């Protein structure tokens, strides 16, 4: 028999974490591991049919992905879709495959709207989600005695696909249904220097625990302006939602990072503005089986796609696609062993949800609602040398914080500042 | 040859203005007229192929509309799409047909984002659009002398597909572009009383000229509370953006209306509560051919779809579909005259845009951007019997705000109130 996998991913543009340049090699490693294992689809063949999800302009689009998916379905009749990664591309395709009753695997599409499993009834997300960053923040608040109020800022940059809007959307909508805190949001524009001044004039009267989604340079500028204005960190703490650790040169591996240094000249005053700043980031798997996967992933990305991978946490999306496809194949074996069909769709997914699986990225846990439990890590500065490193990891399945090698969060006062001053603003 | 016309409208739900139950006989009167005109598309026939834009639940959907459009496009090769009306259903089809280069006619889909025309290329809107309401409001402001502040409120109701959000968005964006005026916006839930109380408590601090988009019976419980809180008509003006005249039994005739009358025991206070309120509706055509067309349309709607057309102002959407299809036929006729073809989407379209027409709704004019120029109307209270009637018709082609003969705006103080209180906020 033949099992057809439909890929709707950016084939030519190699700037997306889910681009076929990076995901492509990983799906090749996975599909050769099912062929080398007798206990996975014994005697069945797995073939991939490629469809693009991007314009003639090379950007993932909401009008090319649905049409590519429709063409793929009509011409190949896929068993499953490897799914777009972009939010606006994945939404229509998610609804379409929900109507067709075919699963949809994807390590992208992290927006909050995909958790409504009455519309995306068959969408399994094997990668990180923005909604599961809000139960990390809730646990962080509980550990540090924050129960009253917080503030959240996201930045507008025309190029991106509203990344911070969706990220803060998930964080905000999840951290106030399981906490009794008062959270308020606010939006500014990146590199509109007149907006930072207004933002600083507003912030003091809006909160003391602040979460910013922006680019690293925007965050560094805000930190410098806050230091100028006297928001010195004995009463403030700024969290930078840098999921992929792009301010930390990829955030993967043990190495001093010092993300406040750019040779700008004012990197001495940009050092004491970061001693009241934490950074939230995806967790780098530490498995010996994960580092061996990246090596051959990079090799085969160079051999077959002429693309050179740079280390970083952005490589956990290829690995999440690997794990998700392996999980799907193992759940499709059990559906056949029980007298089912490869085209159930509905019975296959329920053997993937509320299930825990061992992949290169570690021991997965696909929660009962489809999404996969995500792990994040917290970075803070070392007063000795002033370099950031991971200080506190969060295990998304057990939902409990873990310190690292006897590392304590560096608070200027020794203990976290309250989220409401003594004289309430 | 034959000219196929693909229809994507609700084929079974008769509760939408753009429902095939209503629009169905409207396009049948149009296609029965080209057959009677040797000078319109002489040596061709016209066919209609129907696709539904409805869930299994029975409502507009953004997954069934594009899928029906795709099936129609591939099974039949159309020359034009009569297009959905619901904004969330029309957007995907608009993008699809723009990609295929097939024109899209639609008297619905009034949202502001349909006018980009770098995305929705080849989309002629022959019916009302919410952006054109900002032009009417700007003319009102320039006439009545208030050019420094306004407040807009849109109510949220789970059922409707965010009608008031889109209406107020269009008005807000267009006013902001037309007037150097600072405006505020706010959203209140439709079905709870705490929201109304907080709204009235925080209204005196944000504006004196208020535009309200809400249900006909939720603007009357707001007007009662405002009267009870001392927000008399000396200081405030409350504009009810009731485009389809629900609060006025339709507003299709010259009879007195009394929107404040319910006979529930507090019908006396409501009459002096509505002395501070004006109502903004669409303009009902005043030409005899519109009345004859309605007379034929309601007979045909009953005699072919088993639907009893209500006598209201919501019937200008069927008439808009009729006029738009006749205009498209004229444009394609011209195109064929000059050695063209039915499939020249761009050339057929560019002859529709930026030119006037004579339908049953009057003398049309489609803006150079592709959107018909909309005419609005403004109702007011008679000081004698407290009956509502029109005082100001607005012509969108020449943007002239012309008052009815024998009628004038009646203000409690004899002249419009200021938009900024003399003392201050």
């Amino acid at each position: 028999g033949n099992l057809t996998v439909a890929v709707v991913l950016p084939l030519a543009n190699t700037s997306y974490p889910w681009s076929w340049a990076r995901v492509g090699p990983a799906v090749e490693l996975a599909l050769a591991q099912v062929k080398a294992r007798p206990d996975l689809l014994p005697g069945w063949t797995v073939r991939t049919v490629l469809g693009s999800s991007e314009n003639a302009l090379g950007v993932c689009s909401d009008t090319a992905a649905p049409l590519a998916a429709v063409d793929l379905k009509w011409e190949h009749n896929p068993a499953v879709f490897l799914g777009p990664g972009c939010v606006y591309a994945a939404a229509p395709v998610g609804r379409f495959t929900a109507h067709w009753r075919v699963p949809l695997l994807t390590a992208g599409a992290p927006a909050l709207g995909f958790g409504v499993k009455d519309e995306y009834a068959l969408t399994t997300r094997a990668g990180p989600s923005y909604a599961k960053l809000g139960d990390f923040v809730a646990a962080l608040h509980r550990r540090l005695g924050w129960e009253r109020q917080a503030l959240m800022l996201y930045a507008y940059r025309p190029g991106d696909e509203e990344h911070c809007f969706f990220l803060v959307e998930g964080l905000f909508m999840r951290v106030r249904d399981r906490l009794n805190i008062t959270v308020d949001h606010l939006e500014f524009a990146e590199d509109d220097l007149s907006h930072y001044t207004r933002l600083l004039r507003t912030m003091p009267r809006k909160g003391r625990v602040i979460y910013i989604c922006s680019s690293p340079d925007a965050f560094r500028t805000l930190m410098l302006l806050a230091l100028e204005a006297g928001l010195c960190g004995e009463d403030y703490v700024f969290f930078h939602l840098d999921i992929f650790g792009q301010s930390l040169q990829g955030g993967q591996g043990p190495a001093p990072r010092r993300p406040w240094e750019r040779g700008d000249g004012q990197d001495v005053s940009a050092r004491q503005a970061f001693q009241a700043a934490k950074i939230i980031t995806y967790k780098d798997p530490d498995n010996p089986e994960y580092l061996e996967f990246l090596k051959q992933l990079k090799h085969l990305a160079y051999e077959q796609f002429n693309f050179t991978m740079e280390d970083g946490l952005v490589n956990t999306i290829p690995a999440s696609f690997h794990d998700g496809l392996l999980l799907y194949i193992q759940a499709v074996t059990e559906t056949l062993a029980h007298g089912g069909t490869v085209t159930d769709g509905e019975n296959i997914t329920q053997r993937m949800w509320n299930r825990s699986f061992q992949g290169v990225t570690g021991y997965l846990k696909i929660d009962s609602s489809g999404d996969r439990e995500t792990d994040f890590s917290l970075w803070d500065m070392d007063p000795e040398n002033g370099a950031f490193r991971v200080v506190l990891n969060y295990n998304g399945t057990s939902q409990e914080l873990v310190a690292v090698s006897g590392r304590k969060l560096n608070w200027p006062l020794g203990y976290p500042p309250p989220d409401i001053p003594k004289c309430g603003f | 040859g034959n000219l196929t016309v693909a229809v994507v409208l609700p084929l079974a739900n008769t509760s939408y203005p753009w429902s095939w139950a209503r629009v169905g006989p409207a396009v049948e009167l149009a296609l029965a007229q080209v057959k009677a005109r040797p000078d319109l598309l002489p040596g061709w026939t016209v066919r209609t192929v129907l696709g539904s834009s409805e869930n299994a639940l029975g409502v507009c959907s953004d997954t069934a509309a594009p899928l029906a459009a795709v099936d129609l496009k591939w099974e039949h090769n159309p020359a034009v799409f009569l297009g959905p009306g619901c904004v969330y259903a029309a957007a995907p089809v608009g993008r699809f047909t723009a990609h295929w280069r097939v024109p899209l006619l639609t008297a619905g889909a009034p949202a502001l984002g349909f006018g980009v025309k770098d995305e929705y290329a080849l989309t002629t809107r022959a019916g009302p659009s919410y952006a054109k309401l900002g032009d009417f409001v700007a003319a009102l402001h320039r006439r009545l002398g208030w050019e420094r502040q306004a407040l807009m409120l849109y109510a949220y109701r789970p059922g409707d597909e965010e009608h008031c959000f889109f209406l107020v968005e269009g008005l807000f964006m267009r006013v902001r572009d037309r007037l150097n005026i600072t405006v505020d916006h706010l959203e209140f839930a439709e079905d709870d009383l705490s929201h109304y109380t907080r709204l009235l408590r925080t209204m005196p601090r944000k504006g004196r000229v208020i535009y309200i988009c809400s249900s006909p019976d939720a603007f009357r419980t707001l007007m009662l509370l405002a009267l009870e809180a001392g927000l008399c008509g000396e200081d405030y003006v409350f504009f009810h953006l009731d485009i389809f005249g629900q609060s006025l039994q339709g507003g299709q005739g010259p009879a007195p209306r009394r929107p404040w009358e319910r006979g529930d025991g507090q019908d006396v206070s409501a009459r002096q509560a509505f002395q501070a309120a004006k109502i903004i509706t669409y303009k009902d055509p005043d030409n005899p051919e519109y009345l004859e067309f309605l007379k034929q349309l309601k007979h045909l709607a009953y005699e072919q779809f088993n639907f009893t057309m209500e006598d209201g102002l919501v019937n200008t959407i069927p008439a808009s579909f009729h006029d738009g299809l006749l205009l498209y036929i004229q444009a394609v006729t011209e195109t064929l005259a000059h050695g063209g073809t039915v499939t020249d989407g761009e050339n057929i379209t560019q002859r529709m845009w930026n030119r006037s027409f004579q339908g049953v709704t009057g003398y049309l004019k489609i803006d150079s951007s592709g959107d018909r120029e909309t005419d609005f109307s403004l109702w007011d209270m008679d000081p004698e019997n407290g009956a509502f009637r029109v005082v100001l018709n607005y012509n969108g082609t020449s943007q002239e705000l012309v008052a009815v003969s024998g009628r004038k705006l009646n203000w409690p103080l004899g002249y419009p109130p200021p938009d900024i209180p003399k003392c201050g906020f």
Binding site: Y88, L112, G113, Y156, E187, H195 | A91, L112, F165, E169
Partner: peptide, 24 residues
């Protein structure tokens, strides 16, 4: 959902930051 978050993931409703707190 709130006045800003929890809508549909269509690009047609993202034209204006209406209902959201913004500086632009």
């Amino acid at each position: 959902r709130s006045s800003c978050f929890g809508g549909r993931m269509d690009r047609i409703g993202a034209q204006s930051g209406l209902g959201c707190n913004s500086f632009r």
